[PDB]
Design a protein around this nucleic acid. Structure first.
Ligand SMILES: [Br-]
Lengths: 131, 131
DNA sequence: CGACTTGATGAGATTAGACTG
DNA sequence: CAGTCTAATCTCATCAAGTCG
DNA sequence: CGACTTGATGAGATTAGACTG
DNA sequence: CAGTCTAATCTCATCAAGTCG
């Protein structure tokens, strides 16, 4: 294959500069840049491709639609204590059916005083950890 | 099983509204919304889950790191015409080696008056189209 | 005309060589 | 040394000129 | 103390019901 | 009708409290 080039500091700076003017340059701009900084234009296009590539992937990763968040997370749910009597009953259900529908689910709530919400999270976690 | 909810226009408005206040509400805020608009809080959390999902995938898709170009794209390269004598010679090379390295490539350049730049694209496109 | 052909671009994986901490 | 960087090479898909009956 | 246990969250595929164009 | 939308269900990964000798 071909012999990897090495950019001088002022070569890199010039590229970096033009990339912020527009990152989709036509052959004119590229050709002018190639002469100005002293390197063949095909090399310059391939640098523009990979800078685009790099910046696009790094943005998909880290950027978000909404204006970040200034401060600390809001209050999480305080950890329910599930009683030995509750636990026992939930297990019995889990041994028979591991995917209760809302009918069986809302039934296990009445029997344990837990909210159906938490019944579901219990079976979710239970499945993840005892296949 | 389940049972699909249907949001009233002002329910949706209310959700949409709070989602712009902060999209990661703690259980506290969620509960206040549930009572204010009259539907159990577990449903509100799942709507927030899916709105997040949607806006995040829609942003990964469409948004970009750099300020969009105001106007039209700069000029691409004018299509090189390659003579039958050039083509013929390139074909000869392609039948022997479909992956010339830079040495053979810069050699086909000398022989055709084409730039190695374009030789590379030629073998690229040729392979895509004649396996 | 459209169909077919074939340079030119883009994106997005991939590799391998230099260089660190 | 792995971990990081990034020029260099692919394929794939497609746009945009080109040549056909 | 840490190891081990286990509620609680998020992301991000997946699925299916309602409804269009 | 498929195509769109999106409420509802998953695994998976992980943060954050809890029970232990
Ligand atoms: Br190699």
């Amino acid at each position: 294959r071909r012999r990897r080039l090495v950019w001088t500091p002022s070569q890199s700076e010039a590229l970096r500069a033009c990339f912020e003017r527009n990152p989709y340059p036509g052959i004119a701009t590229r050709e002018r840049l190639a002469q100005a900084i002293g390197i063949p234009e095909p090399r310059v296009q391939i640098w523009f491709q990979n800078e685009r590539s790099r910046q696009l992937r790094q943005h998909r990763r880290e950027s978000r639609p909404w204006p970040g968040r200034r401060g600390p997370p809001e209050g999480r749910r305080k950890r329910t204590a599930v009683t030995g009597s509750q636990t026992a009953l939930l297990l019995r259900a889990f041994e028979k059916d591991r995917f209760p529908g809302i009918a069986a689910r809302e039934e296990l709530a009445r029997e344990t005083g837990l909210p159906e919400s938490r019944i579901q999270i219990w079976f979710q976690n239970r499945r993840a950890r005892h296949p």
